[PDB]
Here is the input.
Amino acid sequence: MIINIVEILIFLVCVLFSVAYLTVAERKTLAYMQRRLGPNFVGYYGLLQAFADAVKLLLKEIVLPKESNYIILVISPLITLITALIGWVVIPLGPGITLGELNLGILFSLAIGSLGVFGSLLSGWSSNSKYSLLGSIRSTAQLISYELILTSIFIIIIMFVSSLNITTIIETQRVVWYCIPLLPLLLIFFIASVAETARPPFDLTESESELVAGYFTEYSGSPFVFFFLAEYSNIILISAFNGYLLLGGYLSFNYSYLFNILFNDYSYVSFLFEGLINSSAYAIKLVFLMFSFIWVRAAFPRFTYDNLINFCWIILLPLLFGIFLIIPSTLYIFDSFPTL
Amino acid sequence: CLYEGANWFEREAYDMYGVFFEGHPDLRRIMTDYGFEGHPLRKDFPLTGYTEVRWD
Amino acid sequence: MNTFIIFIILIPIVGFALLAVNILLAVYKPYNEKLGAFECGLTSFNQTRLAFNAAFILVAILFLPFDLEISTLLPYVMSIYLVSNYGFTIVLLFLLILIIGFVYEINTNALKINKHNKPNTDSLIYK
Amino acid sequence: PSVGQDLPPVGGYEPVQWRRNLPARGFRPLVYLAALCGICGYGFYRALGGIQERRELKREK
Amino acid sequence: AIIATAFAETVKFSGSKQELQKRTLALYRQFLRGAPTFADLYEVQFSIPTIRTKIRQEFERHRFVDDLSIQNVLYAKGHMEYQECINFWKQQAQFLKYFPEEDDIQGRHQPSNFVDKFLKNRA
Amino acid sequence: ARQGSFWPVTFGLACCAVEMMHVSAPRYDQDRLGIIFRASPRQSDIMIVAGTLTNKMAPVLRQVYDQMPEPRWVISMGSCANGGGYYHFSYSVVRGCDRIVPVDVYVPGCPPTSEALMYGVFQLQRKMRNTKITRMWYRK
Amino acid sequence: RIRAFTINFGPQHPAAHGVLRLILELSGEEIIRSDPHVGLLHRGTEKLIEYKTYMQALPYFDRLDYVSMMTNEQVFSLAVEKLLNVEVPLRGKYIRTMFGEITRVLNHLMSVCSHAMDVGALTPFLWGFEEREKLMEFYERVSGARLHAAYVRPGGVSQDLPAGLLDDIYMWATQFGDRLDEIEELLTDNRIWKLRTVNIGTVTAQDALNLGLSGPMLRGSGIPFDIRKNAPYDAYDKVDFDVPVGMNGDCYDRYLIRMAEFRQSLRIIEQCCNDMPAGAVKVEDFKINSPPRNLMKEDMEALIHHFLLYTKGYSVPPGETYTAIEAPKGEMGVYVVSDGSERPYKCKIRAPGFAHLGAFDHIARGHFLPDAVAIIGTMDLVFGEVDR
Amino acid sequence: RPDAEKRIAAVLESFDKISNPAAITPTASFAKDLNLDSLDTVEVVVAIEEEFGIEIPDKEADEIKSVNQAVEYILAQ
Amino acid sequence: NIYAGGSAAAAPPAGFRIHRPATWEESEEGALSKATKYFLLAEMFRGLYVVLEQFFRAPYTIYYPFEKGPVSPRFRGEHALRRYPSGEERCIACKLCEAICPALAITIDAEERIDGSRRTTKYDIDMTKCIYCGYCQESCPVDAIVETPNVEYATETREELLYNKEKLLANGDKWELELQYALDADAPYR
Ligand SMILES: CCCCCCCCCCCCCCCCCC(=O)OC[C@H](COP(=O)(O)OCCN)OC(=O)CCCCCCCCCCCCCCCCC
Ligand SMILES: CCCCCCCCCCCC(=O)OC[C@H](COP(=O)(O)OCC[N+](C)(C)C)OC(=O)CCCCCCCCCCC
Ligand SMILES: CCCCCCCCCCCC(=O)OC[C@H](COP(=O)(O)OCC[N+](C)(C)C)OC(=O)CCCCCCCCCCC
Ligand code: SF4
Ligand code: SF4
Ligand code: SF4
Here is the structure.
């Protein structure tokens, strides 16, 4: 009882910090892409900037305008917050290191990413304006339209494992990663990942819509800190999904020979050293991936909604139907179906 | 009617000068205040004008 | 007591606590010109109902029959070894029956919105 | 008279670059596609070999 | 600017007085129908008949004008003021230019005779 | 916390707005101070009146200022924004936003140098050092 | 009955360039009727020029169109030169050719990068504003202040160059030639930047004339016309360059001709750094601009002239002129009526962006709502122009 | 209908410049019988159509001179 | 020849006719070569690699209260009334700075003092309607008022931003060592 509450404390406090410093690291690298320094006036080298934002942001007042339902206005940050945060269970930081190991962890990871659409759409009706409602329409339609191909990429990957467990996928992956046979799948899963959060390659709401600040324009204080946390938790969460089913989850190399040199016996320093290597490999996958998100933010203009829907439904999805047909046929031609 | 681009100009020459252009769709004021009484670029209108603005 | 359910109980208490520290610690102090929705520093009348395009509603009506297939392909992907050579052909036929309805959709250009910005096609015939 | 002004050099300056400097870089696209198909097909080799090995392991268990 | 604004009218000058009388008649009807829209639109404190009597009084100002040409410029200015008021381009601070004396009593000591004007030398 | 994060609404409208976009430039950075333009007054701490104020915009400037949450300041950038400026004797101008919004720091300069605008920001942050929000409630 | 929902792009909007209220009536996403409002920046600068002398009226021009100062200075100075019947010296012509082109480089730099932000590219904004800082240093050397410089005067030029600037504008040009190839890489052959700007804002060549459109928007649409080649002034005849003129009237050919006027402007700067002569920088006589402070402290005549050109001013012969030059925004001119007194009887700027924003609803019918914003960035609305 | 003409007269009663509210006969001319002005006619016709919720065009508004013509008009709905 | 009327030697240039746009079949690229660039996003990756190159270079930012940017001596900031060597006020009340000021910021009253010398009783600048044109510095024959390159004097009230004679004499006191450096390099060019 003491041991499960200290593990969930330490995983909480490791993830809730790492979503705060993501935004600091984002302003840093976006600054150096644009040939300027990031923040360096808040900590010794600019660190705990996000804590300055957060402590001030909790001190701003909450205004609830006259056209709004005040409950819905404050409950959509809570449900978007928890939905962007409940999905952090099922990721493994090593073999069978989750916060709940269940036999079907992809179906959970895929049902929570389905629950995240509501806090966009529902937030459109709170402070009902006809210039706000239609922007929420465009956002929600984009959000579901790219969730389709997200779910489809998943099911194409589970064609190779035939197990909804996640550490089973990563143990299956030890022979070869799934990015290196399925290279176009990495590119289209990356762009569907950029779409599913509404990053500013694929954004229209925050910048172009009739609101100057997206669907969440009229806010202040706690309803803004919860959305802000939820977007970057969504960043590192879809980064985690890419990290386990397409790149290696915790796998870097074999490291049996290095152990047979170093160690003599199973001991707690050996499990500690192995845990550091496994979570280091997972972390460097996930950090290269958040750098790719920030890197594609820097270089590009944005999309018309027509360009966006024509992109998803007319270009990527027929190609995906060809992928549905070609990959079980390749597992068919050679005598290799995956066993439970 | 001849020129598609003239009308804004005509309408600018309305608001500063009060000159009329008969046969003009959308003749009204431009680049002054909405409730502005007067025609500014005109020798009887004083420089600083007639009114001023504060927050009561 | 696994450590799975501490989490699903424990995220909300963190969120309720941050919402509570905002409600307790910030001032409230509103009035009428502070209230009111934002559009670019200008109030206006909102129209009671506005029109929309058929493709806007058609994206999310059409979304669900593709979503229901993607969850229908999910029973197969777990049993893919057992139905060797046979459930393969059945899933082929299922996907092909879907793909021809999809090519109906892409041939009709149902999700495309046209532009009424026509460049005056008709030339100048005189007299 | 005009003393103490800034004047150009007596030989003039060297010519600057005002043409577009956009040289075509990269391999031919058929090289990238051939490399793509090679990287993919070697990946399919290792993946389907691992699937068959895992099937024999399931037989043993 | 091919197409014009919604409640626009191409400005046109009438050589007869009775056509101008018909047009000012139609224009009073257009102001008078739109007064509930103005009271809703500018969020004013008072009642709709005060807007309607303001509209009547502003036509009572210019009744005995003789010159048809001056009646014509006066009509065109009035239709422009209508087009600004009905489209909601004017704001509530310029809509309430029209009501300077209703909103607040300016204070004590209103000078009426010569003596009260003299003690403050017209202020 | 009120200093190290410092969010203005980008009200700047004329000559002095480009000079603000030199505070966004890579020579005089504002990200390195913590400054970012949340371009909605519902989230900005402060406002910058950077440019003129005509009589057609004075209710609009107030309606933008009315909205911002209650710990709010405003700095007045330029000489057209404090006391009319170059256009002081004009029929359609407000003689400074002092008439409309209650302003805390005046930054003078007709194009007030990006050096000087940043110095006005440092002066406002010094005013935030001695705000004493919690010592005040003890009734010092 | 197509009932249209009405919106504004009001003032507090990032893509509205600050001051632009834009009533748009849309049906779904297509715009069926547009209506720009303007006057939120209007200050009556033109009523104020009539109460100031010409030398005091000189800053009213770089206050408006505040992105490109020296060109606004130049149009009023050339109109007054035409009225005054005086000839500026040779060095004063080559020096206002050169500072009329780093003003052009700075204008296209601000314009292209602000457009690329309004669409969504973030990095050219900062790279271009860096190059703008490298040029504002040159303005700070030449005049006093950076953003507003009263350097180009009706007699000619304010004062001489500083001692070592000519070796410096070369050192900048050598690297700027590469600093602008780099901004060209992630926009010109971006498929996103292409698709977002292909048939947007299409202007037919016969409609570009009825609307009064000029500069990059008239040369977007096929017609080969620019004032510095057609009716040349200020020693642009002596300097060799070419002109880019698009073929389709879209926003992409309005983009591609801006990208090449950088090239042609850098060519101007090099050819004027090499061929700069010596001599006087202001006009010959002290009845229209002031003597040097060496001379007026020694000379009784020149002290009289100095004390009179500032209390009273010089007097202009009675007449009327419209002088038009090519700002980087397009054709900008000024119509000034001279009383014969020392105050102008009447001034009037023709803002180039006034006719462009006035031609908005002719073009922006039937386009979507995102494509009503990339069309703002091509007509280059700085709003010191449009209202004043 | 009978009640509707009473409603027309009850609207027409609530004005001024009528020193005889008992002078509202079914053939009352606005200008002649009631002493109404050039503006008062289209004041009262708009006040009549406000009572019902109908809207009237210009050629059916300029012609109304008597309460007889308003009660003849009433059945547009 | 002779030209028609409606006709100059501005004929169309040799080659003003376009060439017809190429069809798909008259193109040098193969379908496979073109569509490899299509599905493998070629020029997008090129523009990506540009800003990746920019990640690895030197930024431009200077740290403002510790490092100041460029200064030429011609630069203008707040105002200062200088003094002669051996301390005399230099302002002979000639009203030339008042007569030229394009925004009417200067106001001066002048009286003959006890010595019989012409001096200003009141000198004043409104810094809220000053526009920094430097005409007031160009106009003065004694060179009594100048522009110091100080821009760091931002205030919190308007009353503080109205500079009488005493604030400007204290500025021309304070900055005199610096205005020496400015007018040693400017005064030939004036
Ligand atoms: C012989 C075998 C068969 C060979 C073919 C192989 C098939 C499998 C390959 C699949 C890979 C697909 C990758 C996605 C392709 C997207 C296609 C595309 O570029 O979009 C085209 C679209 C324009 O559409 P269209 O109308 O046709 O244009 C005609 C112009 N007249 O233009 C657009 O929509 C805009 C482009 C949007 C692209 C999204 C960019 C966002 C993020 C880029 C991710 C970069 C990743 C970097 C990550 C780190 C890298 C280290
Ligand atoms: C840290 C590991 C990063 C690996 C790079 C990412 C995956 C590979 C992507 C393929 C792009 C490529 O490398 O193509 C190679 C080409 C250069 O060939 P060429 O000069 O055009 O001659 C071709 C002439 N033909 C056609 C006749 C044969 O492009 C480049 O080098 C441009 C710089 C990209 C550098 C990327 C880092 C890799 C070092 C390469 C140094 C030559
Ligand atoms: C349209 C698809 C056409 C494919 C044509 C390729 C023929 C190449 C011949 C090599 C076969 C071989 O020799 O490799 C055999 C391998 C390894 O098996 P093993 O364990 O070593 O055999 C031991 C036999 N036991 C188990 C009984 C002891 O198995 C494979 O499955 C790999 C096949 C190559 C991958 C081809 C994928 C093509 C890309 C498809 C993109 C969707
Ligand atoms: S303060 Fe100066 S630069 Fe700024 S808008 Fe006004 S006149 Fe222009
Ligand atoms: S400062 Fe100069 S111009 Fe002004 S009154 Fe004194 S001497 Fe005259
Ligand atoms: S700098 Fe210009 S505005 Fe200021 S006092 Fe001198 S002349 Fe007047």
